[PDB]
Design a protein around this motif. Structure first.
Motif, PDB file in Angstrom:
ATOM      1  N   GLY A 239      10.208   1.549  30.692  1.00  0.00           N
ATOM      2  CA  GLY A 239      10.216   0.202  31.238  1.00  0.00           C
ATOM      3  C   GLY A 239      10.580   0.160  32.710  1.00  0.00           C
ATOM      4  O   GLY A 239      10.074  -0.678  33.460  1.00  0.00           O
ATOM      5  N   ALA A 240      11.466   1.060  33.145  1.00  0.00           N
ATOM      6  CA  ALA A 240      11.876   1.071  34.546  1.00  0.00           C
ATOM      7  C   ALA A 240      10.732   1.507  35.451  1.00  0.00           C
ATOM      8  O   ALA A 240      10.543   0.947  36.536  1.00  0.00           O
ATOM      9  CB  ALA A 240      13.088   1.983  34.738  1.00  0.00           C
ATOM     10  N   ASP A 241       9.961   2.509  35.022  1.00  0.00           N
ATOM     11  CA  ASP A 241       8.814   2.946  35.810  1.00  0.00           C
ATOM     12  C   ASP A 241       7.780   1.834  35.929  1.00  0.00           C
ATOM     13  O   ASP A 241       7.289   1.542  37.025  1.00  0.00           O
ATOM     14  CB  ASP A 241       8.194   4.197  35.188  1.00  0.00           C
ATOM     15  N   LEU A 242       7.444   1.195  34.806  1.00  0.00           N
ATOM     16  CA  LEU A 242       6.512   0.072  34.840  1.00  0.00           C
ATOM     17  C   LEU A 242       7.062  -1.066  35.690  1.00  0.00           C
ATOM     18  O   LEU A 242       6.308  -1.782  36.359  1.00  0.00           O
ATOM     19  CB  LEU A 242       6.217  -0.406  33.418  1.00  0.00           C
ATOM     20  N   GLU A 243       8.386  -1.246  35.677  1.00  0.00           N
ATOM     21  CA  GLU A 243       9.003  -2.243  36.543  1.00  0.00           C
ATOM     22  C   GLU A 243       9.035  -1.766  37.989  1.00  0.00           C
ATOM     23  O   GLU A 243       8.996  -2.579  38.919  1.00  0.00           O
ATOM     24  CB  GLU A 243      10.414  -2.562  36.045  1.00  0.00           C
ATOM     25  N   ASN A 244       9.106  -0.448  38.199  1.00  0.00           N
ATOM     26  CA  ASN A 244       9.149   0.082  39.559  1.00  0.00           C
ATOM     27  C   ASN A 244       7.762   0.137  40.185  1.00  0.00           C
ATOM     28  O   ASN A 244       7.602  -0.179  41.370  1.00  0.00           O
ATOM     29  CB  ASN A 244       9.792   1.469  39.564  1.00  0.00           C
ATOM     30  N   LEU A 245       6.747   0.535  39.411  1.00  0.00           N
ATOM     31  CA  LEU A 245       5.415   0.735  39.976  1.00  0.00           C
ATOM     32  C   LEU A 245       4.868  -0.541  40.606  1.00  0.00           C
ATOM     33  O   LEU A 245       4.107  -0.483  41.577  1.00  0.00           O
ATOM     34  CB  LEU A 245       4.455   1.253  38.904  1.00  0.00           C
ATOM     35  N   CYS A 246       5.242  -1.704  40.071  1.00  0.00           N
ATOM     36  CA  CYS A 246       4.741  -2.955  40.631  1.00  0.00           C
ATOM     37  C   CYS A 246       5.512  -3.348  41.887  1.00  0.00           C
ATOM     38  O   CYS A 246       5.023  -4.135  42.706  1.00  0.00           O
ATOM     39  CB  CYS A 246       4.803  -4.068  39.582  1.00  0.00           C
ATOM     40  N   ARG A 247       6.735  -2.835  42.042  1.00  0.00           N
ATOM     41  CA  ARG A 247       7.537  -3.166  43.219  1.00  0.00           C
ATOM     42  C   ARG A 247       6.854  -2.731  44.512  1.00  0.00           C
ATOM     43  O   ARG A 247       6.407  -3.573  45.301  1.00  0.00           O
ATOM     44  CB  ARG A 247       8.927  -2.544  43.101  1.00  0.00           C
ATOM     45  N   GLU A 248       6.763  -1.421  44.752  1.00  0.00           N
ATOM     46  CA  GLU A 248       6.256  -0.947  46.038  1.00  0.00           C
ATOM     47  C   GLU A 248       4.734  -1.003  46.097  1.00  0.00           C
ATOM     48  O   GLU A 248       4.156  -1.294  47.151  1.00  0.00           O
ATOM     49  CB  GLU A 248       6.764   0.469  46.329  1.00  0.00           C
ATOM     50  N   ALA A 249       4.061  -0.728  44.978  1.00  0.00           N
ATOM     51  CA  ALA A 249       2.601  -0.748  44.990  1.00  0.00           C
ATOM     52  C   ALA A 249       2.070  -2.175  44.905  1.00  0.00           C
ATOM     53  O   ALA A 249       0.924  -2.440  45.286  1.00  0.00           O
ATOM     54  CB  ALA A 249       2.050   0.108  43.852  1.00  0.00           C
ATOM     55  N   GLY A 250       2.886  -3.107  44.408  1.00  0.00           N
ATOM     56  CA  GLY A 250       2.503  -4.507  44.453  1.00  0.00           C
ATOM     57  C   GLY A 250       2.514  -5.064  45.860  1.00  0.00           C
ATOM     58  O   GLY A 250       1.734  -5.964  46.186  1.00  0.00           O
ATOM     59  N   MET A 251       3.402  -4.547  46.713  1.00  0.00           N
ATOM     60  CA  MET A 251       3.318  -4.839  48.139  1.00  0.00           C
ATOM     61  C   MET A 251       2.022  -4.288  48.720  1.00  0.00           C
ATOM     62  O   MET A 251       1.470  -4.838  49.681  1.00  0.00           O
ATOM     63  CB  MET A 251       4.537  -4.256  48.858  1.00  0.00           C
ATOM     64  N   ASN A 252       1.515  -3.201  48.133  1.00  0.00           N
ATOM     65  CA  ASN A 252       0.224  -2.664  48.549  1.00  0.00           C
ATOM     66  C   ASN A 252      -0.920  -3.379  47.839  1.00  0.00           C
ATOM     67  O   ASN A 252      -2.092  -3.187  48.183  1.00  0.00           O
ATOM     68  CB  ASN A 252       0.169  -1.161  48.270  1.00  0.00           C
ATOM     69  N   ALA A 253      -0.597  -4.204  46.844  1.00  0.00           N
ATOM     70  CA  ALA A 253      -1.624  -4.911  46.094  1.00  0.00           C
ATOM     71  C   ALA A 253      -2.105  -6.134  46.863  1.00  0.00           C
ATOM     72  O   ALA A 253      -1.314  -6.878  47.450  1.00  0.00           O
ATOM     73  CB  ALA A 253      -1.097  -5.327  44.718  1.00  0.00           C
ATOM     74  N   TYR A 254      -3.422  -6.341  46.838  1.00  0.00           N
ATOM     75  CA  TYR A 254      -4.087  -7.429  47.548  1.00  0.00           C
ATOM     76  C   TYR A 254      -3.705  -7.418  49.023  1.00  0.00           C
ATOM     77  O   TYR A 254      -3.550  -6.344  49.610  1.00  0.00           O
ATOM     78  CB  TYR A 254      -3.735  -8.772  46.907  1.00  0.00           C
ATOM     79  N   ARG A 255      -3.524  -8.590  49.633  1.00  0.00           N
ATOM     80  CA  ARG A 255      -3.142  -8.645  51.045  1.00  0.00           C
ATOM     81  C   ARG A 255      -1.761  -9.275  51.165  1.00  0.00           C
ATOM     82  O   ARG A 255      -1.600 -10.496  51.125  1.00  0.00           O
ATOM     83  CB  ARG A 255      -4.197  -9.418  51.828  1.00  0.00           C
ATOM     84  N   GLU A 256      -0.741  -8.417  51.316  1.00  0.00           N
ATOM     85  CA  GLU A 256       0.559  -8.833  51.830  1.00  0.00           C
ATOM     86  C   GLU A 256       0.758  -8.356  53.269  1.00  0.00           C
ATOM     87  O   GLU A 256       1.729  -8.749  53.926  1.00  0.00           O
ATOM     88  CB  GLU A 256       1.681  -8.309  50.914  1.00  0.00           C
ATOM     89  N   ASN A 257      -0.183  -7.556  53.787  1.00  0.00           N
ATOM     90  CA  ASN A 257       0.028  -6.722  54.966  1.00  0.00           C
ATOM     91  C   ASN A 257      -1.249  -5.973  55.352  1.00  0.00           C
ATOM     92  O   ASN A 257      -2.106  -5.720  54.495  1.00  0.00           O
ATOM     93  CB  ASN A 257       1.193  -5.758  54.700  1.00  0.00           C
ATOM     94  N   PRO A 258      -1.413  -5.603  56.623  1.00  0.00           N
ATOM     95  CA  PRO A 258      -2.712  -5.125  57.126  1.00  0.00           C
ATOM     96  C   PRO A 258      -3.191  -3.778  56.599  1.00  0.00           C
ATOM     97  O   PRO A 258      -4.359  -3.447  56.826  1.00  0.00           O
ATOM     98  CB  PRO A 258      -2.467  -5.040  58.640  1.00  0.00           C
ATOM     99  N   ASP A 259      -2.352  -2.992  55.930  1.00  0.00           N
ATOM    100  CA  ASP A 259      -2.707  -1.614  55.612  1.00  0.00           C
ATOM    101  C   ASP A 259      -3.958  -1.543  54.736  1.00  0.00           C
ATOM    102  O   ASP A 259      -4.320  -2.499  54.045  1.00  0.00           O
ATOM    103  CB  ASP A 259      -1.539  -0.909  54.917  1.00  0.00           C
ATOM    104  N   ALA A 260      -4.628  -0.391  54.785  1.00  0.00           N
ATOM    105  CA  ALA A 260      -5.964  -0.224  54.226  1.00  0.00           C
ATOM    106  C   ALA A 260      -5.964   0.099  52.737  1.00  0.00           C
ATOM    107  O   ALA A 260      -7.039   0.289  52.158  1.00  0.00           O
ATOM    108  CB  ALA A 260      -6.719   0.867  54.989  1.00  0.00           C
ATOM    109  N   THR A 261      -4.794   0.164  52.103  1.00  0.00           N
ATOM    110  CA  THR A 261      -4.687   0.443  50.680  1.00  0.00           C
ATOM    111  C   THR A 261      -4.876  -0.809  49.828  1.00  0.00           C
ATOM    112  O   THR A 261      -4.727  -0.748  48.601  1.00  0.00           O
ATOM    113  CB  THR A 261      -3.337   1.093  50.369  1.00  0.00           C
ATOM    114  N   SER A 262      -5.195  -1.939  50.458  1.00  0.00           N
ATOM    115  CA  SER A 262      -5.311  -3.233  49.797  1.00  0.00           C
ATOM    116  C   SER A 262      -6.441  -3.282  48.775  1.00  0.00           C
ATOM    117  O   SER A 262      -7.370  -2.470  48.825  1.00  0.00           O
ATOM    118  CB  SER A 262      -5.521  -4.328  50.844  1.00  0.00           C
TER     119      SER A 262
END
Lengths: 721, 480
Positions: A667-690
């Protein structure tokens, strides 16, 4: 019959005369809704209110506003005669200031603005004192106006919006029962405790012969605790207001200013007035100064002032019809001999508030100003201010909002009107935005020194994922003994404490045990490692024994105890060996001697257990392990949808492909994976991993798989053995 | 009863009289002692008068005690008067008071027992409409005594007075607030046991008392098999009481008592708890969670007094378990025998304590694996008593004890599970009925009801607790 009760208004209706009357209570009187009411009682004091229906209240009592009870001098449980009357409207009303300690009053305009919009169709009569708060916390409080004459005098009138209001401003005093009295509604704090503290001195102080020797021996003494002068001390002077008796004040500045021979004679001097003013109540908040004694030498004056106070209560037969009470900051700074008979016996511990209890304390300081409860449903409601605030108290909240009032000032007062005459335009400009109370939360003012605290969670089962096998199993353990017990006596099974959990930290485990407390509608007591490391540093490890005794009154409540045993193995080896530590044995021995059948539920958790006692495995103590499996595909998908419901949704994120390949993420990994990679999810920021699914896969390769078959096998070996 | 004069030395007078007021008052109250003679002198102020541990409390404290010493010395011992004193505890007393020329007899007033509490309750039982023979059980004091632990008369008086408000809140406030007392409210006054039970659930009960005793309820009707140890427990404990003229015939030496080992509380906590009731003696339990309360509150020195406490309460059995658990952490002790600084007070005492007394030394542990070679030697802990796992005939006798309180039906068969499993101990058999008994019959909607497999489903989850190696380890450590 007609006799409908008076009480302390929960919904305040800051507009007076708006007093709540139940729909079921008004049909007992056969009076319909929205009519002028005539309240008539003993002493021939009268007042008029407007009927509005609340919900939770029943027909047994009618819950009435404070000032309208302060107008008729009503005490809880009095006798009144109320009925519906004819309805009229005012024309032109004249008001006058009430000057006693007030030092005159408001000078300038606002005879129309401030009065008119606050009228809201109040039923009233001539020579009645209306309370109109608002416009700010500091400088404007509940304020009473003496009404001189209205054109429809003595007849039932509801002053309308098109009716003018005249303020004579001629200085005078109150005709009817002004402030300097604090009603139980004007009081705020612990609810049931307020009724429990008063009920012992309620019947005697009212009438001597109503309850004297009948039921039991009356109260000898009462010791009070908590923030002495946060408004806990205001309760002292407040209790003497409803009783109407004399209030003797034992205070700091007098005992400090009176040295040898001055204070010794003053102790009998204040006791001489106790016999003269009898019946009277004696409140001492100086127990900290008077009798701090731990049995050391504080000097002769300290032993002389306490020895006299012991004889002052002993010099009384216990009947002058008087009750001596006391108060102090905490459970400490008190003389140990005070618990001996012949002197103070009852000790009532005053605790702190809760999310609902804080709203009661805030409600007292909520209205000096233009706020609302039903009129702003959420944004300005007190619970939104309650959830962020933790470890405060009335005076701290009062000084916090007063400092937060300066936020309302600095956005208005200094750069606009510095003039001594108060303009009429600045009055409309006065409101309170939640940002003023939020800016104080970011600023350093909040501090919590309180050792022992409790809480309640927000977590429900809607945010919970899979592992429904433990779900109904948690209901099996905890929820059955509450409703069943006549069934519990049918099977005749023995008692027990509670289950125990193990798994990687906070996967679902901190959330799962946090979810059960809300569903059962019970309280939540958390004993945690970082919470305990705060306890034994501040010498609260002895108060842990009190926390054990604290759980029985707050019951039903679950006790959640984790990683206290983490400091056990360092002194001596303990896993199944069971040699722990000197403070931890206070946990062990208590669980052996604590009474079962209570509403307490023993719960524990850890990453891999690997620290325990063979007694902790035995009954009367920690019990059968509950295996937390890693979420499966159907469990992960249920957990992933909880994480992605707050984030935006789009086909770019596929939850099916990552669920099939990875069976082992907790559960912690599933809770963790959305933390930092969710910032990479869609557009929160200009980086190309969106807007890619590979961003979850890129972090999937970096994070460990957390798949260990050996530790799962180690759980099955340690569980049976 | 004596009819003589009673002189009162009290707190408020000694506190209100400072230098020169109290010093003259000491002879003033002593002057009335000679005038009112014969009279008795009671001082409850020994805590205030002479707390002295030999520090400086000020001149008034040393002056008031030095006079009270001379006030009793100023008397020839005949005015025909008796001076007595009282204090809260064994502490707060002047050490020189035990010297001759002054107070000699010290009578320690303890706390009550299940029967003693009934005597204290009986005083406060009737201000009210209760009864003893007229209500045989429900309102009788023993039902109130077994739940209450660590109370005292004034605490019980204030507890029932607070519990009287329970009788009030159900009657007085919402019915009659009038000052004139109606005649109808008099019939309405009774006391239901729920009023006294509501105070037990509420936080009022608190026990700060260090040293306490108790007696059990356990008889041999709830006990299971292992009758070989049963008559063996009677052999050790019960013989020296009736026999001793036979004990002098054989001329065998004395001894302390046996020792037990086995998984925690299987029958072991119940077995030693059963023998105390049959012999009609008292029961003194020294237990790990009970000791961890002692040495935190500085009662580890009072353990020496608990040793002296056992001789008056005798006949009583002393039950000592897992005090040695904290021994190996400081230094290695199993057969080595290097224990700990407080634990040696246990050791040395058992060497110097007198035998032939009504005390019976008993100990227990999961696997012994902590001991001293002196604890194996005589005058101390003695020959081990092996607790076997209950056999089929023993398990069936234990299972019928667990299922007699639960309902009975053919759905539960005790024969099939007894044949397949030979190794379950007493705790497992006591545990299996706990959670699976909630699954037994209908206590709840779940579908595991009225089945024998619910005991079998939990049978696979719980460990078999069958270890032949630790049983072999017992036989090797016992002889060696």
């Amino acid at each position: 019959g007609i006799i409908l009760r008076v009480a302390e208004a929960n919904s305040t209706d800051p507009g007076m005369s708006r007093v709540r009357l139940d729909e079921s209570s008004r049909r007992l009187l056969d009076a319909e809704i929205g009519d002028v009411v005539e309240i008539e009682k003993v002493r021939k004091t009268v007042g008029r209110v407007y009927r509005a229906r609340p919900e939770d209240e029943n027909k047994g009592i009618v819950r009435i506003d404070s000032v309208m009870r302060n107008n008729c001098g009503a005490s809880i449980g009095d006798k009144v005669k109320v009925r519906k009357v004819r309805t009229e409207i005012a024309k032109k009303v004249t008001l006058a200031p009430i000057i006693r300690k007030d030092q005159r009053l408001k000078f300038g305009e606002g005879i129309e603005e401030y009065v008119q919009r606050a009228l809201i169709r109040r039923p009233m009569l001539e020579q009645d004192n209306i309370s109109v708060p608002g416009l700010t916390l500091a400088g404007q409080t509940g304020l009473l106006f003496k009404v001189v004459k209205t054109l429809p005098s003595k007849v039932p009138v509801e002053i309308g919006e098109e009716t003018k209001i005249e303020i004579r401003e001629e200085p005078a005093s109150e005709v009817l029962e002004e402030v300097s009295r604090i009603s139980y509604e004007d009081i705020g704090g612990l609810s049931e405790q307020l009724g429990k503290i008063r009920e012992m001195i309620e019947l005697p102080l009212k009438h001597p012969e109503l309850f004297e020797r009948l039921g039991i021996t009356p109260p000898k003494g009462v010791i009070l605790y908590g923030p002495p002068g946060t408004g806990k001390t205001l309760i002292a002077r407040a209790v003497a207001n409803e009783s109407g008796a004399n209030f003797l004040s034992i205070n700091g500045p007098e005992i400090m200013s009176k040295y040898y021979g001055q204070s010794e004679q003053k102790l009998r001097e204040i006791f001489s007035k106790a016999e003269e003013t009898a019946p009277s109540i004696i409140f001492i908040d100086e127990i900290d100064s008077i009798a701090p004694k731990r049995e050391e030498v504080q000097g002769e004056v300290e032993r002389r002032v306490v020895a006299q106070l012991l004889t002052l209560m002993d010099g009384m037969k216990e009947r002058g019809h008087v009750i001596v009470i006391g108060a102090t900051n905490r459970i400490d700074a008190i003389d140990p001999a005070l618990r001996r008979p012949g002197r103070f016996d009852r000790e009532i511990e005053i605790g702190v508030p809760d999310r609902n209890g804080r709203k009661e304390i805030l409600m007292i300081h909520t209205r000096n100003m233009p706020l609302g409860m039903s009129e702003e449903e959420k944004n300005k409601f007190l619970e939104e201010m309650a959830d962020y605030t933790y470890g405060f108290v009335g005076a701290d909240l009062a000084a916090l909002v007063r400092e937060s009032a300066m936020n309302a000032l600095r956005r208005y007062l200094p750069e606009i009107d510095l003039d001594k005459p108060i303009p009429t335009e600045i009055l409309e400009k006065m409101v309170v935005t939640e940002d003023d109370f939020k800016n104080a939360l970011k600023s350093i003012e909040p501090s919590s020194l309180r050792e022992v605290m409790v809480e309640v969670p927000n977590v429900h089962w809607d945010d919970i994922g899979g592992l429904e096998d433990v779900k109904r199993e948690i209901k099996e353990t905890v929820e059955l003994p509450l409703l069943k017990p006549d069934v519990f006596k049918r099977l005749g099974i023995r008692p027990s404490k509670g289950f125990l959990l193990y798994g990687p930290p906070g996967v679902g485990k901190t959330l799962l045990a946090k979810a059960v407390a809300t569903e059962s509608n019970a309280n939540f007591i958390s004993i945690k490692g970082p919470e305990v490391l705060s306890k034994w540093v501040g010498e609260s490890e002895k108060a842990i024994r009190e926390i054990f005794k604290k759980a029985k009154q707050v019951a039903p409540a679950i006790v959640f105890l984790d990683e206290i045993d983490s400091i056990a193995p360092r002194r001596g080896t303990t896993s199944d060996s069971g040699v722990t530590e000197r403070i931890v044995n206070q946990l062990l021995t208590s669980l052996d001697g604590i009474e079962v059948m209570n509403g307490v539920v023993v719960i524990g958790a850890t990453n891999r257990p690997d620290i325990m006692d063979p007694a902790l495995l035995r009954a009367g103590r920690f019990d059968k392990l509950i295996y937390i499996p890693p979420p499966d595909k159907e469990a992960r998908l249920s957990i992933l949808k909880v994480h992605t419901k707050n984030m935006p949704l789009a086909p770019d994120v596929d939850l099916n492909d990552i669920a099939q390949r990875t069976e082992g993420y907790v559960g912690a990994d599933l809770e963790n994976l959305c933390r930092e990679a969710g910032m990479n999810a869609y557009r929160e920021n200009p980086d190309a991993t969106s807007v890619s699914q590979k961003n979850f896969l890129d972090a999937l390769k970096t994070i460990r798989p957390s798949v260990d078959e050996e530790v799962i096998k180690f759980y099955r070996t340690l569980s049976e053995t």
